[PDB]
Write an enzyme that holds these catalytic residues in place. Structure first.
Site, PDB file in Angstrom:
ATOM      1  N   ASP A 104      -6.320  12.274   4.039  1.00  0.00           N
ATOM      2  CA  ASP A 104      -5.986  11.602   5.314  1.00  0.00           C
ATOM      3  C   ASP A 104      -5.882  12.596   6.496  1.00  0.00           C
ATOM      4  O   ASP A 104      -5.139  13.601   6.413  1.00  0.00           O
ATOM      5  CB  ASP A 104      -4.667  10.842   5.148  1.00  0.00           C
ATOM      6  CG  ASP A 104      -4.842   9.505   4.500  1.00  0.00           C
ATOM      7  OD1 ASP A 104      -5.979   8.990   4.470  1.00  0.00           O
ATOM      8  OD2 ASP A 104      -3.821   8.957   4.032  1.00  0.00           O
ATOM      9  N   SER A 147     -18.458   5.646  19.069  1.00  0.00           N
ATOM     10  CA  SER A 147     -18.246   4.223  19.350  1.00  0.00           C
ATOM     11  C   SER A 147     -17.464   3.602  18.213  1.00  0.00           C
ATOM     12  O   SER A 147     -18.022   3.308  17.151  1.00  0.00           O
ATOM     13  CB  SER A 147     -19.576   3.462  19.591  1.00  0.00           C
ATOM     14  OG  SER A 147     -20.532   3.646  18.547  1.00  0.00           O
ATOM     15  N   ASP A 165      -1.354   2.878  20.358  1.00  0.00           N
ATOM     16  CA  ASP A 165      -1.412   1.462  20.010  1.00  0.00           C
ATOM     17  C   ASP A 165      -2.703   0.945  19.387  1.00  0.00           C
ATOM     18  O   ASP A 165      -3.162  -0.155  19.685  1.00  0.00           O
ATOM     19  CB  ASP A 165      -0.982   0.619  21.201  1.00  0.00           C
ATOM     20  CG  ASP A 165       0.279   1.151  21.843  1.00  0.00           C
ATOM     21  OD1 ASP A 165       1.315   1.236  21.137  1.00  0.00           O
ATOM     22  OD2 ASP A 165       0.203   1.571  23.021  1.00  0.00           O
ATOM     23  N   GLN A 189      10.502  -6.783  14.498  1.00  0.00           N
ATOM     24  CA  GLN A 189       9.816  -6.338  15.712  1.00  0.00           C
ATOM     25  C   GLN A 189       9.251  -4.920  15.755  1.00  0.00           C
ATOM     26  O   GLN A 189       9.085  -4.353  16.835  1.00  0.00           O
ATOM     27  CB  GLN A 189      10.659  -6.632  16.960  1.00  0.00           C
ATOM     28  CG  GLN A 189      12.077  -6.047  16.921  1.00  0.00           C
ATOM     29  CD  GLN A 189      12.123  -4.556  17.248  1.00  0.00           C
ATOM     30  OE1 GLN A 189      11.777  -4.128  18.361  1.00  0.00           O
ATOM     31  NE2 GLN A 189      12.642  -3.758  16.316  1.00  0.00           N
ATOM     32  N   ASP A 236       0.737  -0.490  -0.677  1.00  0.00           N
ATOM     33  CA  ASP A 236       0.581   0.656  -1.583  1.00  0.00           C
ATOM     34  C   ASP A 236       1.975   1.184  -1.836  1.00  0.00           C
ATOM     35  O   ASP A 236       2.273   1.630  -2.925  1.00  0.00           O
ATOM     36  CB  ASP A 236      -0.238   1.824  -0.967  1.00  0.00           C
ATOM     37  CG  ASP A 236      -1.758   1.552  -0.911  1.00  0.00           C
ATOM     38  OD1 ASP A 236      -2.241   0.477  -1.332  1.00  0.00           O
ATOM     39  OD2 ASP A 236      -2.421   2.397  -0.295  1.00  0.00           O
TER      40      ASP A 236
END
Ligand SMILES: CN(C)c1ccc(-c2c(N)ncnc2C#Cc2ccc(N3CCOCC3)nc2)cc1
EC number: 2.7.1.20
Length: 329
Positions: free
Chosen positions: A17, A31, A129, A288, A299
């Site tokens: 990762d 893109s 975000d 929230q 996982d």
């Protein structure tokens, strides 16, 4: 404690990762939709090398099955090397980093190393975000059982184990080797667990997924995955609380253990189906959470759950740690 090493065996696709923070002037090049997870194509080859350069990154030992085994070892503060993990990596620096990040997790990893392909890798491209994920399997998809899992020294670690778990993504790589482990769980009546992983496995690898199904002690899956799995095999129901019943009444080779089907529902209940009847456990809320990992938290459920089953605890307590685990993430 008195839990023992190599007690839980895992095996799957080791991905390295690579997260960071980018912008978009870095994304438009290749893109990529700000919040989408797809596979790398030959036009994305550089994107990896160009994420270790212009951006400050973290390096975590990733991949579903590997994620679950590390969380299971985390909730397994001791001993160490309680959980083992087999996978394929390349003989490059990326694999070097992977071998390192895993030991730095008290995970007993034992990789099949090779040159043909690079060590696979997932790319966390966060703009704060968003979550544009680029996955390139490479080496994780070159695992050879005859030159790794079949070897005495590693195969003996599968023997030291009393619980096996493999995410179903691994059926896309090696069902023959998924099988040797499942079959073995039967022959020596130990527990063998499996993940549906993604709906595509049920739709496009059913032949491989039905071969192991009879050898599958516990089955992990989610809402949607559950949904597609029923769609194919012909369960008719759409009611999860029911699908868990029809599935778990599937021809189980070993008959000495009746099976348990844990269908998660993201963050909203959990449906367990046992030899008796179906219950339902509500989740721990953390409301929230705009950051809510969501994708990839199942996982974590699986690791926490596994951590409690390697000790033969009440299924209700395996499900408790599933929530403690998912998530700190
Ligand atoms: C959504 N993407 C990024 C995605 C999802 C999930 C993974 C994934 C994870 N997390 N952990 C371990 N292995 C894999 C793996 C794997 C994998 C993914 C797809 C695939 N195929 C899809 C198209 O048809 C051929 C089979 N075959 C194998 C990686 C990437």
């Amino acid at each position: 404690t008195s839990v023992r090493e190599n007690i839980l065996f895992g095996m799957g696709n080791p991905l390295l990762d690579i997260s960071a923070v980018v912008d978009k002037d870095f994304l438009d090049k290749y893109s990529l939709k700000p919040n989408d997870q797809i596979l790398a194509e030959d036009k994305h080859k550089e994107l990896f090398d160009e994420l270790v350069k212009k951006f400050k990154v973290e390096y975590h030992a990733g991949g579903s099955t590997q994620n679950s085994i590390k969380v299971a070892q985390w909730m397994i503060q001791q001993p160490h090397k309680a959980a083992t993990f087999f996978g394929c990596i390349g003989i490059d620096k990326f694999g070097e980093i992977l071998k390192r990040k895993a030991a730095e997790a008290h995970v007993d990893a034992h990789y099949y190393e090779q040159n043909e392909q690079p060590t696979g890798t997932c790319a966390a491209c966060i703009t704060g975000d968003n979550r544009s994920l680029i996955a390139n399997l490479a080496a994780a998809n070159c695992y050879k059982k005859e030159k790794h899992l079949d070897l005495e020294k590693n195969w003996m670690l599968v023997e030291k184990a009393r619980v096996c778990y493999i995410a179903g993504f691994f059926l896309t790589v090696s069902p023959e080797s998924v099988l040797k482990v499942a079959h073995h769980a039967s022959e020596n009546n130990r527990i063998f667990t499996l993940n549906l992983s993604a709906p595509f496995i049920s739709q496009f690898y059913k032949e491989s997924l039905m071969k192991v199904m009879p050898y599958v002690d516990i089955l992990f899956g989610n809402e949607t995955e559950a949904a597609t799995f029923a769609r194919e095999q012909g369960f008719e129901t759409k009611d999860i609380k029911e699908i868990a019943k029809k599935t778990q009444a599937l021809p189980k080779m070993n008959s000495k253990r009746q099976r348990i089907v844990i269908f998660t529902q993201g963050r909203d209940d959990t449906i367990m189906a046992t030899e008796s009847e179906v219950t339902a456990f509500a989740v721990l809320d953390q409301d929230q959470k705009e950051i809510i990992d969501t994708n990839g938290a199942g996982d974590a459920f699986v690791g926490g759950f596994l951590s409690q089953l390697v000790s033969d605890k009440p299924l209700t307590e395996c499900i408790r740690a599933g929530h403690y685990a998912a998530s700190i993430i």
